Amino acid sequence: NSIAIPTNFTISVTTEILPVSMTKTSVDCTMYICGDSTECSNLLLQYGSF
Amino acid sequence: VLPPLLTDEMIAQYTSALLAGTITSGWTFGAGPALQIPFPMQMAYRFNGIGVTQNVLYENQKLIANQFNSAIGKIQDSLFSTPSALGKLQDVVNHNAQALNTLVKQLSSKFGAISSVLNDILSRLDPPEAEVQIDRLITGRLQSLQTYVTQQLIRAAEIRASANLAATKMSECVLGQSKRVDFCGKGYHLMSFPQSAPHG
Amino acid sequence: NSIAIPTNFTISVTTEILPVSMTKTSVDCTMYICGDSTECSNLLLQYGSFCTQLKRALTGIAVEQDKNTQEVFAQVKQIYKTPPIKYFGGFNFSQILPDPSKPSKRSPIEDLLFNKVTLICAQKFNGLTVLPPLLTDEMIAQYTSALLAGTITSGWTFGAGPALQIPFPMQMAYRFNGIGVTQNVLYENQKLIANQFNSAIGKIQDSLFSTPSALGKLQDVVNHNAQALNTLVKQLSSKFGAISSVLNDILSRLDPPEAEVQIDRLITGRLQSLQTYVTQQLIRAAEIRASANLAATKMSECVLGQSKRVDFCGKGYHLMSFPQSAPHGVVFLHVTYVPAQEKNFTTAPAICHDGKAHFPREGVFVSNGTHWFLTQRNFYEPQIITTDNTFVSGNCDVVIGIVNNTVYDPLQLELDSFKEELD
Amino acid sequence: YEPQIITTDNTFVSGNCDVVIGIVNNTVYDPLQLELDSFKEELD
Amino acid sequence: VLYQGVNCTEVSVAIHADQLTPTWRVYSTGSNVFQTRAGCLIGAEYVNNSYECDIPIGAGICASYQTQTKSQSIIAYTMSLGAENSVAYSN
Ligand SMILES: *[C@@H]1O[C@H](CO)[C@@H](O[C@@H]2O[C@H](CO)[C@@H](O[C@@H]3O[C@H](CO)[C@@H](O)[C@H](O)[C@@H]3O)[C@H](O)[C@H]2NC(C)=O)[C@H](O)[C@H]1NC(C)=O
Ligand SMILES: *[C@@H]1O[C@H](CO)[C@@H](O[C@@H]2O[C@H](CO)[C@@H](O[C@@H]3O[C@H](CO)[C@@H](O)[C@H](O)[C@@H]3O)[C@H](O)[C@H]2NC(C)=O)[C@H](O)[C@H]1NC(C)=O
Ligand SMILES: *[C@@H]1O[C@H](CO)[C@@H](O[C@@H]2O[C@H](CO)[C@@H](O[C@@H]3O[C@H](CO)[C@@H](O)[C@H](O)[C@@H]3O)[C@H](O)[C@H]2NC(C)=O)[C@H](O)[C@H]1NC(C)=O
Ligand SMILES: *[C@@H]1O[C@H](CO)[C@@H](O[C@@H]2O[C@H](CO)[C@@H](O)[C@H](O)[C@H]2NC(C)=O)[C@H](O)[C@H]1NC(C)=O
Ligand SMILES: *[C@@H]1O[C@H](CO)[C@@H](O[C@@H]2O[C@H](CO)[C@@H](O)[C@H](O)[C@H]2NC(C)=O)[C@H](O)[C@H]1NC(C)=O
Ligand SMILES: *[C@@H]1O[C@H](CO)[C@@H](O[C@@H]2O[C@H](CO)[C@@H](O)[C@H](O)[C@H]2NC(C)=O)[C@H](O)[C@H]1NC(C)=O
Ligand SMILES: *[C@@H]1O[C@H](CO)[C@@H](O)[C@H](O)[C@H]1NC(C)=O
Ligand SMILES: *[C@@H]1O[C@H](CO)[C@@H](O)[C@H](O)[C@H]1NC(C)=O
Ligand SMILES: *[C@@H]1O[C@H](CO)[C@@H](O)[C@H](O)[C@H]1NC(C)=O
In angstroms, the Cα distances linking E70 to B17, E33, E63, E67 are: 75, 21, 18, 6
Mutate to test the interface with E, among C78, C104, C129, C143 (most CBs of E within 10 A): C78
In the three-class reduction of DSSP (H, G, I as helix; E, B as strand; rest coil), residue C334 is classed as strand
B56 burial type by CB count under 10 A (0-12 exposed, 13-18 middle, 19+ buried)? middle
Q: Whose CA is nearest to atom 2 of ligand 9?
A: E91
| Whether B166 and A34 lie within 8 Å, measured CB to CB | no
Gaps in chain A with C–N over 2.5 Å, residue before each: none
D17 touches chain C (CB under 8 A): no
The rounded distance, in Å, linking the Cα atoms of E21 and E5 is: 16
The rounded distance, in Å, linking the Cα atoms of B88 and B79 is: 13
Ligand 5 center from residue B52 Cα (angstroms): 30
Ligand number, closest to the Cα atom of D22: 6
Q: Give the Cβ contact number of residue E14 at 10 Å.
A: 14
| DSSP run (H or E) holding C280 | helix C256-298
Reported structure resolution in angstroms: 2.8
Q: Please tell me if the CB atom of residue C344 comes closer than 6 angstroms to any atom of ligand 7.
A: yes
C377 burial type by CB count under 10 A (0-12 exposed, 13-18 middle, 19+ buried)? buried
Beta carbons of C290 and B159 less than 8 angstroms apart: no
Strands C390-395, C372-375: pairing is unpaired
| Straight-line distance from the first to the last Cα atom of chain B, in angstroms, rounded to the nearest whole number | 18
Helices assigned H by DSSP within C189-215: 190-210
| Whether C234 and A48 lie within 8 Å, measured CB to CB | yes
Angle at C368 between CA C367 and CA C369, to 5 degrees: 90
Give a three-class secondary structure readout of C43-110: HHHCCCCHHHHHHHHHHHHHHHHHHHHHHHHCCCCEEEECCCCCCCCCCCCCCCCCCCCCCCCCCHHH
In the three-class reduction of DSSP (H, G, I as helix; E, B as strand; rest coil), residue C365 is classed as strand
In the three-class reduction of DSSP (H, G, I as helix; E, B as strand; rest coil), residue B55 is classed as helix
β-strand partners of E67: E72
C156 touches chain E (CB under 8 A): no
C206 burial type by CB count under 10 A (0-12 exposed, 13-18 middle, 19+ buried)? exposed
User: Which other chains touch chain D, taking contact as 3+ CB pairs less than 8 Å apart?
Assistant: C
Ligand 7 center from residue C349 Cα (angstroms): 19
- Cα dihedral value B12, B17, B21, B22, nearest 10: -10
Per DSSP, which regions of C100-232 are E strands? 128-131
Identity of the amino acid at B112: G
Beta carbons of C307 and C318 less than 8 angstroms apart: yes
Picking from B42, B106, E89, B118, the residue whose alpha carbon sits closest to that of residue C88 is: E89
Among all residues of chain D, which has the CA nearest to that of C421?
Answer: D43
| Close Cβ partners of C104 (under 8 Å, ≥ 6 residues apart) | C111, C137, C138, C141
Max intra-chain CA distance, chain D: 47
Picking from E50, E48, E44, the residue whose alpha carbon sits closest to that of residue E75 is: E44
Angle at C12 between CA C9 and CA C14, to 5 degrees: 160
The rounded distance, in Å, linking the Cα atoms of B7 and C195 is: 44
The rounded distance, in Å, linking the Cα atoms of C205 and C219 is: 19
| Ligand 5 atom at minimum distance from C403 CA | 27
The rounded distance, in Å, linking the Cα atoms of C169 and C177 is: 12
Helices assigned H by DSSP within chain B: 8-25, 28-31, 39-50, 54-59, 61-81, 87-105, 118-124, 127-169
| Ligand 2 atom at minimum distance from C8 CA | 1
Q: Give the Cβ contact number of residue B121 at 10 Å.
A: 23
Picking from C5, C363, C314, C10, the residue whose alpha carbon sits closest to that of residue C180 is: C363
In the three-class reduction of DSSP (H, G, I as helix; E, B as strand; rest coil), residue C417 is classed as helix
Strands C351-352, C403-404: pairing is parallel
Strands C403-404, C2-19: pairing is unpaired
Characterize C401-413 residue by residue with b for buried, 16 or more Cβ atoms within 10 angstroms of its Cβ, and e for exposed. Answer: ebbebebeeeeee
Q: Give the Cβ contact number of residue C145 at 10 Å.
A: 24
A38 touches chain B (CB under 8 A): no
The rounded distance, in Å, linking the Cα atoms of B74 and B76 is: 5
Task: Read off φ and ψ for residue C9, nearest 5 degrees.
Answer: -150, 170
Ligand 4 contacts (CB < 6 A) are C 368-371
| Ligand 5 atom at minimum distance from C355 CA | 5
Q: Whose CA is nearest to atom 11 of ligand 7?
A: C344
Phi-psi domain of C76 (left: phi exceeds 0; alpha: psi -120 through 50; beta: other): beta
Picking from E83, E6, E70, E84, the residue whose alpha carbon sits closest to that of residue E38 is: E6
Picking from C380, C378, C311, the residue whose alpha carbon sits closest to that of residue C339 is: C378
| A24 chain-B contacts, CB cut-off 8 A | 1-4
β-strand partners of C331: C17, C324
Per DSSP, which regions of C261-406 are E strands? 317-326, 329-347, 351-352, 356-360, 364-367, 372-375, 390-395, 403-404
The rounded distance, in Å, linking the Cα atoms of C272 and C105 is: 46
A11 touches chain B (CB under 8 A): yes
| Whether A48 and C237 lie within 8 Å, measured CB to CB | yes
Quote the DSSP letter at residue C301.
Answer: I
Mutate to test the interface with A, among C227, C273, C279 (most CBs of A within 10 A): C273
The rounded distance, in Å, linking the Cα atoms of E45 and E52 is: 16
Angle at C355 between CA C351 and CA C356, to 5 degrees: 55
**Are chains B and A in touch, 3+ Cβ pairs below 8 Å?**
yes
Ligand number, closest to the Cα atom of D24: 6
Q: Give the Cβ contact number of residue C41 at 10 Å.
A: 17
The rounded distance, in Å, linking the Cα atoms of B42 and B24 is: 9
Ligand 7 center from residue B39 Cα (angstroms): 16
Ligand 9 contacts (CB < 6 A) are C 85, 87; E 90-91
The structure's method of determination equals: cryo-EM
Q: Give the Cβ contact number of residue E83 at 10 Å.
A: 8
Ligand 9 center from residue C243 Cα (angstroms): 80
The rounded distance, in Å, linking the Cα atoms of C319 and C155 is: 11
CA atoms within 13 A on the CB side of C148: 28
Beta carbons of E77 and E46 less than 8 angstroms apart: yes
E6 burial type by CB count under 10 A (0-12 exposed, 13-18 middle, 19+ buried)? middle
Quote the DSSP letter at residue A24.
Answer: B
| Whether D21 and C89 lie within 8 Å, measured CB to CB | yes
